[PDB]
Symmetry: C3
Subunit: 309 residues, 3 copies
Amino acid sequence: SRTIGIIGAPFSKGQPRGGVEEGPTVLRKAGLLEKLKEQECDVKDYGDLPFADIPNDSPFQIVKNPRSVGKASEQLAGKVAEVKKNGRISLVLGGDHSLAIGSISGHARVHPDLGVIWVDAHTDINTPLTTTSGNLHGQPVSFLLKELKGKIPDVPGFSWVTPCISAKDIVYIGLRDVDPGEHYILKTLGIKYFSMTEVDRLGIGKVMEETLSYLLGRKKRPIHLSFDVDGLDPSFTPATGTPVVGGLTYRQGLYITEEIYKTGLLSGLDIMEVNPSLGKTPEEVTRTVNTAVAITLACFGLAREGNHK
Amino acid sequence: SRTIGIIGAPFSKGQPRGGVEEGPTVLRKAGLLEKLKEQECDVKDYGDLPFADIPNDSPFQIVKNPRSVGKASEQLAGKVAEVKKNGRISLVLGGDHSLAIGSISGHARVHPDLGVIWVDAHTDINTPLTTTSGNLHGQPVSFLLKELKGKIPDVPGFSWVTPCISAKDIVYIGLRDVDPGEHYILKTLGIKYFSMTEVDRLGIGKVMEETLSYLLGRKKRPIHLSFDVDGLDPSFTPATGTPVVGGLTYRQGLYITEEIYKTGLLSGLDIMEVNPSLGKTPEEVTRTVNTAVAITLACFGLAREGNHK
Amino acid sequence: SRTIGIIGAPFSKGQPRGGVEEGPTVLRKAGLLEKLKEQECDVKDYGDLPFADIPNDSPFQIVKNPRSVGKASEQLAGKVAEVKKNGRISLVLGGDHSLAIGSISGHARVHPDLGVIWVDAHTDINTPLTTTSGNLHGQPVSFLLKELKGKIPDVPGFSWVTPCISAKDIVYIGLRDVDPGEHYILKTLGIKYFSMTEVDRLGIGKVMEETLSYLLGRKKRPIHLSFDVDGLDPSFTPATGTPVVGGLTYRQGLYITEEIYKTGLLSGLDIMEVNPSLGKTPEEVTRTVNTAVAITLACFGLAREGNHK
Ligand SMILES: N[C@@H](CSCC[B-](O)(O)O)C(=O)O
Ligand SMILES: N[C@@H](CSCC[B-](O)(O)O)C(=O)O
Ligand SMILES: N[C@@H](CSCC[B-](O)(O)O)C(=O)O
Ligand SMILES: [Mn+2]
Ligand SMILES: [Mn+2]
Ligand SMILES: [Mn+2]
Ligand SMILES: [Mn+2]
Ligand SMILES: [Mn+2]
Ligand SMILES: [Mn+2]
């Protein structure tokens, strides 16, 4: 069938609010393993990677925690190749979406041919020289992008990085807050993206068919879904660090995942940007966490129409 | 025009929470008659059927209140034929969705040629031998289904039942919680169904056109819409006994009904599973009840674009 | 590029609740000017028109404040021609949707060839002789409509009015509460309209393409978008005087505006029916006001996918 390879990643130095490290914990305690098990799958729990804080991690210009971040992605990069090595799907319940540099790295080391689906309200493609806020959780893509190589400077922590995916091989879904420089990158590189504008025009039914035919048209290669919880409307996932209104509906989040699942080409998965601490009432934490589990499971089989052996 | 035949059915022994018997009451007191009247229709209020509790109604295996349930459907079965007999549309504001065995019975006795539209978050097609919870409110379809005859055992209360509708003559809309055995029945019998997955893919616009062309393609026969309030998202109908998230929007519920109305082939209608007692605030009761009325009326003419004589 | 011409219009005598006059104020204080500026546009703030209350404004039959209303539209009519005169888009943050008679007047005086997009949960096409409630905020269209001339009586305050737009030149979007007489006008005149029923059938993607091809098919003429905040669901714009459930989603409101913007044929705009006083919590005021700004800006360039110079 499809074997799962779990990697907990309680990292938060890719952005300001630390709580995001609570993700693996909360995710796990919400009953993620048993639920996957209730389905058809050999869950391999490679545990939570221990990250040793970098004592002297002085900024690169305005970029905070570069080494702290770059190593977490390096550590994670190795691991992710080990699970893809044991012929299993890599499942990364992350902290901040900066780890994406890591996930996609180890995955590519194995399947350099993969295709990416970036579900997120943000592009996360700012470079170390375009970032305004200066947080790394919003620049992962620019490190992975081949056509962007040369645009990216030499930052402490990422000597190891080698651009793996090309502009013609990633698709964005759920975008509604792109920085002026990120938009310039989007249109100039010719990146395929479905902002909330297109989801409204085509509906999620057409959006999914187009993303997948655009990705799996020529060849049937490995798929990597980087999933940022803030891709969905804050009424479904309120406990995120950077939420925007006009997001994807509970149902829309479930359609994407069921459709990706259905192709059976998923090789890598990451569930990012959830921070229970940032939720208002205790139920908003429940609402953001449960919704998160409700999506992971759909990726691994669960369909609203039913299942059976 | 189209004459209405009202039948109140305060039954609840098809499931655990009794409040569902409040439906006819609350429905009526919400001003259902006058509103229908405000439109074009001869409302015939055949009243609320008096159900005498069955003193000794011991379970059939794990199936509770079999006789209590089977007779309510038998009583109701008769009545429903009387209204279809007086050339009127049968309108059943029910209690629990177990009465469906009854509604569809008396209706079929008259128009054995009818077609069914099961709007519900659940299939309600468990047999007396597949039911896990063991409640009858989640097995009505298996009693009505011809291809299922032979699968259904001999249970106290339903000697009278004769499978009326066939697998190729019912359509499910709003499904998102189907039991492992129910799903096996769905796919094996080749039943037409639009789970929330398809509503997301095709949108309600295409879903309605496809359900109706699939049903009314060959011939223009009678239509029976069994409507379970939990078919809609619990933010619109929170006062239900078994609600699921990811449901149908207020607007989507209204589109189905306006489209069914527009065909003018509606012969039977049932509004089930509403239980005011199960609502949190007093307004959630108002929200679930009013939404319910807002759908009934659409079935009988009211259109968001307007009306006039 | 596209120059903006602002006209504040704190008018409320077109309906009962006065607060609607707070619109220009709240709108402005919410940072509307700077935000437009953040984009590409020469904002011309022609200020808030001073309206002198009419001491003796006795009703015309059941029509309250006729002169008070008719002059506000006359005053506004002049002004709107001045901004269209300075080759700028007319932006009218109004009070009650009765001012529409005015906006569309001065605009037409300049571009008698314009096309109209009436986004609203209501048709607002009752005549002085069909109006039941008797409020003018729900009859603006009947004064502007050519085919309706002759149906409209001679009411104090509007001798100046000359029907500018024809039945084949306006489109309604977001309708869900049309009076029996308004519906009769709709169907008889052959007016193009997309009630919530059609938005559900075609989705907003098809709705926008059809409205614009129906309007801009033959010729590429000026566009006037009259925007009533109650066109959207009261969960997005709760602080309105006459809100209805089943409305347009935040996202749907944004799609319309981005699509209208994209044609680059917008010449006139009005943002009506917002009344902060009528909101429950202080945040519902924030929710209704911010949502309003989020739409204005989309009309003038802001796109969820991004922007840049
Ligand atoms: N435009 C923002 C992007 S924040 C992105 C956050 B997240 O990882 O959740 O997408 C910046 O420059 O930090
Ligand atoms: N799978 C559940 C179905 S409960 C159905 C409830 B109702 O009538 O509301 O659809 C069971 O076996 O009882
Ligand atoms: N049918 C109502 C329409 S109220 C319309 C209000 B508004 O301007 O917001 O659309 C009447 O006759 O007053
Ligand atoms: Mn992200
Ligand atoms: Mn994000
Ligand atoms: Mn049911
Ligand atoms: Mn149900
Ligand atoms: Mn209006
Ligand atoms: Mn309105």
